[PDB]
Symmetry: C3
Subunit: 112 residues, 3 copies
């Protein structure tokens, strides 16, 4: 055990006119890829294992610079990423393949 | 330190054109519901209490599958969600009612 | 000083049409500013030091109400935010200058 489970999902949302519970919102359009969960918290020295399941219809990236993690998970595939969180801090979990405000970044927090 | 306070807010942002400090951006249109804060970090075994106030115009969801948390908070209503974080890991906090890239997910991190 | 490092980046994404790996995405338009990373996890009591480098084209905000943190970092400037997380909990890290769903909020988690 001990592995985290991060699922990468794509969302193509277009709602020209939202009308629910007496509330109306217009021209909603957002396309994003999300890491679920986005945040991983571990202790310094912890052996980290992240099972990344890419549910996006295309290749997705999973990078954490501080620990030399820069992976590309093929569409519909799963890749287990392992590394030792030998440095305390907050590190961005990001996709090197797509714009960060499309594929939203997450965070790897390594606490003392 | 007795419990967590999460406010669910809706943001209807429409900025056809904006120039600030000489920098221009055009056709900004984003409608989102955010959990504030999005991330909750607890220790394994903690009796978690999340006071969720829904300031969104419509009913909102708050789910954490790993702990059987699945709530619907009516607009303007505040609900206390209680569960024991009996499993360490990272668990997506999401809305089971709306598109995940509209109502952005958060994370419940349960550390050893 | 091994402190926290956060970079505030702006993304002006516009993709009317793009076909990648046989998948076509259309009408993508998102402008956001992100705190990278968005999540900071600390222990109640420790002296927090956050070095915020603002890579946004304009002045950016960094606020955490619970600890009276509220700064405005000029474009291209780096500012060190210092405070003591004297209260355990989850607190929203937000930009007090821009819309919450444009400059996405983060979280400061203070673990007891
Ligand atoms: Cu991506
Ligand atoms: Cu929702
Ligand atoms: Cu801002």
């Amino acid at each position: 055990e001990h592995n985290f489970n991060v699922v990468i999902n794509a969302y193509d949302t277009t709602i020209p006119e939202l009308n629910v519970e007496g509330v109306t919102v217009k021209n909603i359009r957002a396309f994003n890829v999300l890491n679920e969960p986005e945040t991983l918290v571990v202790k310094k020295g912890d052996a980290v294992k992240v099972v990344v399941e890419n549910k996006s219809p295309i290749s997705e990236g999973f990078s954490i610079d501080a620990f030399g993690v820069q992976e590309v998970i093929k569409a519909g595939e799963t890749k287990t990423i392992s590394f030792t969180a030998d440095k305390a801090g907050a590190f961005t979990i990001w996709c090197q393949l797509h714009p960060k405000n499309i594929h939203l970044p997450g965070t790897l927090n390594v606490v003392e």
